[PDB]
Amino acid sequence: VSASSRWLEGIRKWYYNAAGFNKLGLMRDDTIHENDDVKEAIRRLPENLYDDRVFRIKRALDLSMRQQILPKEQWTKYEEDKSYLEPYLKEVIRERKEREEWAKK
Amino acid sequence: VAPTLTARLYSLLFRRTSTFALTIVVGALFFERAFDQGADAIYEHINEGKLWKHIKHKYEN
Amino acid sequence: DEDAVPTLSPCRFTGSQICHREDGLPLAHVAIAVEGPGWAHPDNVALQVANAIIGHYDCTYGGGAHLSSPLASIAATNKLCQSFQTFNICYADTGLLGAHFVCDHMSIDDMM
Amino acid sequence: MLTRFLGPRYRQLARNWVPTAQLWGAVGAVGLVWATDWRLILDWVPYINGKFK
Amino acid sequence: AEPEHDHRKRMGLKMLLMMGLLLPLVYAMKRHKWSVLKSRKLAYRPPK
Numbered sequence: 001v002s003a004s005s006r007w008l009e010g011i012r013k014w015y016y017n018a019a020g021f022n023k024l025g026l027m028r029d030d031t032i033h034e035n036d037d038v039k040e041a042i043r044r045l046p047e048n049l050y051d052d053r054v055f056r057i058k059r060a061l062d063l064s065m066r067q068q069i070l071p072k073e074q075w076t077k078y079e080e081d082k083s084y085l086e087p088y089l090k091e092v093i094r095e096r097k098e099r100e101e102w103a104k105k
Numbered sequence: 106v107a108p109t110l111t112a113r114l115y116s117l118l119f120r121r122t123s124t125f126a127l128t129i130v131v132g133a134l135f136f137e138r139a140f141d142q143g144a145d146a147i148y149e150h151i152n153e154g155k156l157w158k159h160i161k162h163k164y165e166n
Numbered sequence: 167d168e169d170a171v172p173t174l175s176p177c178r179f180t181g182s183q184i185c186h187r188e189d190g191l192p193l194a195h196v197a198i199a200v201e202g203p204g205w206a207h208p209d210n211v212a213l214q215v216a217n218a219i220i221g222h223y224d225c226t227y228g229g230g231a232h233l234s235s236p237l238a239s240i241a242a243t244n245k246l247c248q249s250f251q252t253f254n255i256c257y258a259d260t261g262l263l264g265a266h267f268v269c270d271h272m273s274i275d276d277m278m
Numbered sequence: 279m280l281t282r283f284l285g286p287r288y289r290q291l292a293r294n295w296v297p298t299a300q301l302w303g304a305v306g307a308v309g310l311v312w313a314t315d316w317r318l319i320l321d322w323v324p325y326i327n328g329k330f331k
Numbered sequence: 332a333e334p335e336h337d338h339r340k341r342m343g344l345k346m347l348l349m350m351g352l353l354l355p356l357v358y359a360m361k362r363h364k365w366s367v368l369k370s371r372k373l374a375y376r377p378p379k
Contacts, residue, residue, distance in 0.1 A: 051377055052377075055373075055375040059373065066368075
């Protein structure tokens with residue numbers, strides 16, 4: 001709760017800012033590497049999130065191309081950083097792991 | 106004699122790919138000579154050690 | 167009448183592109199044009215002749231392969247579109263001269 | 279059986295492409311001349327007399 | 332040891348002058364073609 005948790009939280013906030021995806025309006029989940037589990041989670045996203053995710057990636061690739069970056073006010077703020085993919089990814093993994101358990105017997 | 110200048114180049118020579126090519130080939134010929142002599146003379150000035158000495162030894166052949 | 171009656175100012179033609187990507191719609195619509203001269207210009211007649219040679223097509227036209235216009239003919243046999251139309255739109259001292267077409271996602275390139 | 283390409287349109291076609299086929303040949307010529315330094319042909323050009331005599 | 336010494340530096344001089352002419356030009360050719368992309372503007376317009 002206290003001093004320590006905030007210190008780990010501020011270290012996490014620090015890494016986040018240093019990581020710099022925020023500068024390209026990206027969200028953490030937009031940066032995930034695409035393996036099968038992930039490819040499936042993307043697939044399972046609802047229409048809105050899927051569309052928003054493509055616009056973000058596009059906005060970033062465009063920025064990344066001309067090596068520019070977004071004005072500071074438009075950077076994504078840490079913990080306003082919605083992890084939209086997580087629940088889907090989690091379930092896809094959970095599904096795979098069950099297949100895997102069955103494959104052992 | 107400036108706006109109409111690159112305009113004429115385009116009108117008379119760059120429009121067709123025919124002329125465009127003909128002009129760069131005619132343009133490669135003259136340029137080669139002008140760049141060669143022009144650069145030889147720059148290599149010539151910064152030196153004066155090679156065959157400027159020729160006037161002496163030879164002629165006596 | 168008297169004061170407060172302005173004329174029309176010329177309109178700069180630019181020459182660019184606007185792409186509204188939307189994979190939800192089933193057929194692509196594309197419209198391309200160069201700057202044409204206005205209403206007044208004598209040369210709208212020759213442009214209309216050339217446009218006519220290119221003509222128009224639609225999937226309900228009888229005569230596919232045998233159509234005179236090569237665009238129309240190649241479009242029908244190879245099924246490169248659902249429709250296409252040339253146009254020559256006129257305004258004061260300018261205009262849009264070109265064509266518009268409607269086709270399947272994998273046929274935009276061949277069509278162009 | 280090359281009588282397929284004999285008619286008014288083909289005759290109109292040939293003419294429309296002549297200035298172009300002619301200008302392509304001028305390109306090919308000067309291009310050949312300048313690339314091998316064709317002594318015979320070059321010596322007649324005002325400047326580019328970098329072979330003195 | 333190096334008989335080609337002079338001639339090489341004459342070519343090297345020419346290599347520097349050619350490059351100084353060619354480099355900016357090819358760069359401008361490439362920037363001109365990349366223009367379309369550099370100034371492209373995007374807009375996102377979702378339903379609702």
